[PDB]
């Protein structure tokens, strides 16, 4: 009903909660991406990929996902 916004609480596939820290295109892949800081350290990065920073968080709490792979509740 409404587009995602920075700061929104989201649930990534598998029902992993996090907050949106980045939205848009990135250098590592085409299309739209969502940079999320997860509640749990089950992520893959600190908000950067290949030395390029999109956002910042603990090294194991950041992940980038397609907006289609996350939902609100």
UniProtKB/Swiss-Prot annotation:
Superkingdom in the source lineage: Eukaryota
Start and end residues of each stretch annotated as Important for tubulin binding: 43-47
Signal peptide stretch: none
Compartments where located: Cytoplasm; Cytoplasm, Cytoskeleton; Cytoplasmic vesicle membrane; Cell projection, Ruffle
Domain CAP-Gly intervals: 24-66
Processing and modification events after translation: Phosphorylated. Phosphorylation induces conformational changes by increasing the affinity of the N-terminus for C-terminus, resulting in inhibition of its function thus decreasing its binding to microtubules and DCTN1. Exhibits a folded, autoinhibited conformation when phosphorylated and an open conformation when dephosphorylated with increased binding affinity to microtubules and DCTN1. Phosphorylation regulates its recruitment to tyrosinated microtubules and the recruitment of vesicular cargo to microtubules in neurons.
Tissue expression profile of the protein: Detected in dendritic cells (at protein level). Highly expressed in the Reed-Sternberg cells of Hodgkin disease.
Oligomeric form and interacting partners: Interacts with MTOR; phosphorylates and regulates CLIP1. Interacts (via CAP-Gly domains) with tubulin. Interacts with SLAIN2. Interacts (via zinc finger) with DCTN1. Interacts with TUBA1B, MAPRE1 and MAPRE3. Binds preferentially to tyrosinated microtubules, and only marginally to detyrosinated microtubules.
Free-text note regarding domains: Intramolecular interaction between the zinc finger domain and the CAP-Gly domains may inhibit interaction with tubulin.
Function text: Binds to the plus end of microtubules and regulates the dynamics of the microtubule cytoskeleton. Promotes microtubule growth and microtubule bundling. Links cytoplasmic vesicles to microtubules and thereby plays an important role in intracellular vesicle trafficking. Plays a role macropinocytosis and endosome trafficking.
UniProt protein name: CAP-Gly domain-containing linker protein 1
Organism expressing this protein natively: Homo sapiens
Upper lineage: Eukaryota, Metazoa, Chordata, Craniata, Vertebrata
Part of the whole protein covered: 57 to 127 of 1438
